[model samples]
Target: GFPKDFLWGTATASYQIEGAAFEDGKGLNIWDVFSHQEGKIFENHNGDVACDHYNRLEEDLDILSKLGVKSYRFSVSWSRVLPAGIGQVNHKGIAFYQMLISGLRERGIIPCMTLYHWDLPYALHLKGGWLNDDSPNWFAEYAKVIKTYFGKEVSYFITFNEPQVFVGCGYLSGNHAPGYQLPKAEIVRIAHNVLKAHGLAVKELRKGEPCKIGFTGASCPCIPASDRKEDIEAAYNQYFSSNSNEFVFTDAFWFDPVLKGRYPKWVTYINNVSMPIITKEDMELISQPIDFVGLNIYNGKYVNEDGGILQKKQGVPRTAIGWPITQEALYWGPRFTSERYHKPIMITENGMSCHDCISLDGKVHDENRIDYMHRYLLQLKKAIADGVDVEGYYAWSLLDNFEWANGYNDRFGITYVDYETQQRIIKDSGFFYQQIIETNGDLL
Candidate 1:
């Protein structure tokens, strides 16, 4: 079972959930521009209205209260608060977030704020975005603004969400928003600037309030294929190794610089890939002391004794989004991350998307999601019992809203949303999660 005070919560990002894309003096974000372009998102869909959470804040907060979540994790749109990325505060945009935080607090829920979650201000993008040297200062300024306004009410702050995803998918693959196929060297530089921004933001967030800070990045563990010691060692070694260009998605690329002040040695030798130019001062500024590590884990890859990632067989279980059903990721993700970083771990995002729809009985019965959570939570409990320093868990989302480039094609929330009528129905899995929270996971 989990600890008595373990934080049970749900998470959402500013761009993913909060609509009002251009409302209330809010500046255009990278997403606002990318989604407007043709052939970018599924079915050419965009987050114009989304779940309309910006206008329906009270209704969503009531849903949170009904779920009985002890904590709520949400991100602040940099452009929303400071239109054009710097200078000139947007009071209306700030008021919206203020109401969001105040509403959560009024419900006796811990408000966990993420400073950046893949929504870079478009003005900053015009100024070379993360590639520019001044980018860190921009983030630091934004961090200070957040501290000055809501720092006293917020006890936990996440500097940035997923640098690998934003950099890799946005710059490398050209799959997600702000899509651009940048050169390898330029991509590396962009990631480096992002880490530096994170460090600078950490410094800014700690200025006034006594709050905990962390970096939330995706974690994909290399699970051992067997219980053999060689396989275990191979899996652990492979977990942190960034041996090739494609393999740079591992935690080492982003986590090592923040936690260890240096990039992995293997990162420098990738063939034809120009590594980021590193300096003593850059490393010093990149590695800041953080209170915890927030990981958004969804799956894992199995590694054999020879350190080879084994592919799953045909007809294996997969989610509606085609992500393989690998529950062991929850167990090994925290265990391996804590063993290396030695920081308290928070599963900031973990949930599956199902093909959900309103049923003939006038209820959304997502039994697939219920089974998925049951199995995953059991693995997490096993990790906790084995001495992993896991402090909390925040389900991937609280509602089904705009899911980036996938648009509304996927549903990853326990609460089902009908985008047509803006109606929300707590799925069977949501009720199941409520029970788990009410029992503190003892019911699992």
Candidate 2:
């Protein structure tokens, strides 16, 4: 069974759901430009008018109230507040979030605020984005503005979500925006600046504030090829291992510096690349004590670190999104992360994409989704029972909206949203999840 204080919740991002692309003095975000390009997203689907959550927030809140979630994890669009990345505060954005938080509390649901989740302002990109050393100071300035407004409403603040995806995919792979495939030296520089910005934001957030602060990042977690102790240990070793391909994503490079206050040794060993500029002053601010560390996990690969191969097994279950199903990721990912970082952990994102459609019975029956959650969450329960200090688990999403580059092709939401009609229909998994929350996960 889960801890009594476990926060059962769901999450969403701004550009993915809120379709006020230019409303209320909100400035254009990178996504606003990225999604408009030809062949940039599936069927050229842009978030110009998403679920209309900007106007239908009350209806969405009612859905959450019925589902009985204890908390809702959502992001603030940086552009919404600073329209041009640094200028006068947008009162409309502030007022909108105030009402949203107030409504969530009225229904006895707490609001968990994530300061930045991609969606960088177009103006900021012109300034070299994270490559600019001043970016950290800029983020710190932005943090102060939000803390003043959200300080009373939110107890937990996530400074940034998934640095790997933003820095790795966008900077290295050119798969995410503001996409660019730069040289190894530049990628390292961008990464260093990003962490600095994170640390600065944390410092700013803690300045005379009553709220707790945390950070979240996604992981390409590894599970053991076998359950043997050696295999498990090998996988754990591989979990924190770094990359030979300079652009390869790993658990260590992004996280180690924040929690442990130094770049990984493998990162420093990139022979030809020059390390980003740093100072003893910077490390102290970057490694500030956080209330917790959040992990956004989805899938994993089998690892035999001694032989040094990480591979997917044949005939493993696959999702419509082509992501492999490895339920143990939920178990081992948190176990290894918590063991290493020594921070209370939260599963910030765990959900599957389904080819959901309305059945002849006029309802969405997603048995696969229910079973997916069952297997994954069962392992999460095991992780906790084994003494992993897990604090909470939030589903990846609460509604089906834009899935970034894949656009509308994937459905990760337990709540089915008719993009055209904006009607929210709770699927079978939603009812099942609601029961799990209501029972504090005892049935699982």
Candidate 3:
């Protein structure tokens, strides 16, 4: 069983779940523009009216109460609050979140706010986004806004969520918002600017009424193919490796500086030629201490005894979204992250997307999702028992909403949302999760 104080929660990003786009003084964001263009999202779907969560706030809170979670991790839309990314604040945008934070407290659920979740204000994008050196100060201003208005209510503040995806996929693959396939040097510069923004945000968040702050990023954990000592060593080596040009995508690049106050030796070595100039002052700005480090884990790779990654056998189990159903990820992801960063670990996002629908019985009988969660949670408990300082777990979401480029095609929620009629139905997985929360993961 997990610790009694372990936090069990659900997570949702504003653009992923909330609708009411462009309403009440909300300005345009990169996603709003990208999704409006053709060949971006699945079937030209935009988040214009996502799940309409902005309108159904009370109904969603009631669902969370029924699910019995102890906390709720949600992100605020940057453009919604500061339409131009700085200066004037939107009262309606702030009031919407005020109602959200207040409603969570009224239901005994701690509010964990994520400052940015890939939704860069279009105004900021026009001004150079993460490329401009002034981006860090812009983020600091936004962080101050969040701290000033919602600091008293929010217990946890995540500076950014999944910078790797936004930086890698958005800039490298040109598949996400403000898409562009830039030179490697430009990519490195953008990434550097992002880290500085995080550090600046941390400084702002530390100003009033102490609260736990963290950086949340997604990574597929590397797990030992077996329990043998050699296999475990191979997995560890792969998990902590920072010597390759591909280091930018690794946890080492994303977290080492923030946690250890220095880039890996090889990272500095590789950046000597054609890379962004490394400065002592910039490193200091990018290395602010955080309360915890959050990992958004989904699956994992297997490593053999010789430090080689093993490929999965064909036809292995997979989720509806084609993500491999690797339960070992929940175990090794936390263990390796805790060992390296030496910070309290939070499984900020872990869950599967299923082809969910309400059956003829008028209920969502998502037994697959329940089984997926059960298998994953059992391994998470194993990591805890083996001495991982795991503090909390937040399921990916509470309702089936827009899943980014996949649009409404993938459903990664315990509660089924009828997109056409906007009705909610709690699946069997929701009831199972409630029991697990009630027993503090002992039910598994």
User: Which candidate should be chosen as best, given lDDT against the real structure?
Assistant: 3
lDDT of 1 by residue, 1-444 (tens): 899899999999989888898888899989999988989998888887888899899999998989999999999999999999999988898899899989999999999999898889999999989788798899989998999899989989999888778888888888876899888778778888888888888888889879989898888888898879888889988898875466447798899999999887765654455566777888999998999999999888988888899978699888888988888989988998989999999999999888999999999988988888899899999999999988889987799878888899999988888998989899998889899999999979
- Candidate 1, residue 96: lDDT: 91
TM value for model 2? 0.97
Note the clash tally of each candidate.
0, 0, 0
Q: State, as a TM-score between 0 and 1, how close model 3 is to the true structure.
A: 0.98
lDDT of 2 by residue, 280-332 (tens): 77778788888888889888877874726666668878898999988989999
Candidate 1 residues lying further than 4 Å off, grouped into runs, are 267-276
> In angstroms, how far off is 131's CA in candidate 1?
1.3
Ranking by TM-score: 3, 1, 2
Tell me each candidate's TM-score.
Answer: 0.97, 0.97, 0.98
lDDT of 3 by residue, 133-247 (tens): 7988999999999999999888699999998889888888888988888777777788888899999999999998899999987878888988988888789888877654576
How well does model 1 score by local distance difference test?
0.88
Q: What's the CA error at residue 320 for candidate 2, in Å? A: 1.1
